[PDB]
Amino acid sequence: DSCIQFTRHASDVLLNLNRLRSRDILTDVVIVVSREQFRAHKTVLMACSGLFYSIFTDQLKCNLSVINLDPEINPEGFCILLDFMYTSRLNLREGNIMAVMATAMYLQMEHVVDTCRKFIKASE
Amino acid sequence: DSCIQFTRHASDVLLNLNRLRSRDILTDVVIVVSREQFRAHKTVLMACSGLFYSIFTDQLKCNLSVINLDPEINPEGFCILLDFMYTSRLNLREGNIMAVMATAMYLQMEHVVDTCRKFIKASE
């Protein structure tokens, strides 16, 4: 086509989606990770995670308002990844890298798994 | 903070949101523009438009599944803008620029109004 493109559009959309999340506006699911709960938008989760894409395209699970993750999943690891989904920013640290990588593998977030593997290989 | 950032993340999220829209997955509103209907996600509309942000933060309107736009709004103009919201790409042409600008003004999409004004000024 002969379209023009607004460079910052995708980033501005994501910034607004994060603002809606912070104010709990039109959030439609709560992700339970052991003792912790995280409110989010199903569409953003599906757009970032192979696991959530699978869950919310399921004819029964698409209607659930609560999703319980595997008890081995670390809440801090999940929190860091949920923040990444809504911001493009990953708070990767020596103290959390193993939990972040294991959570990214479970959530099926290939690019996060890739940078974790690379940061781990550099430290060995 | 000491975060790392994935450059393509925002664009990949938007691409997936558009794929969900095309397959009618978790769309939660229909926008009626005279004889035409457009299914979309409320969060994306709010993230792109001052008008939709106002509508869906309203305590009564947030729960509506159908929103009827002003009868002066052109459906093709709306379609071009809805595509822009989900892709960052604006199909701006001599034959549609007046309708696109009027629709962008109504929807409160400042950056679209700005490029329309500039393209119009160049042709006079």
Binding site: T7 | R89, L90
Partner: peptide
Amino acid sequence: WVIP
């Protein structure tokens, strides 16, 4: 705005 750019030509993509």
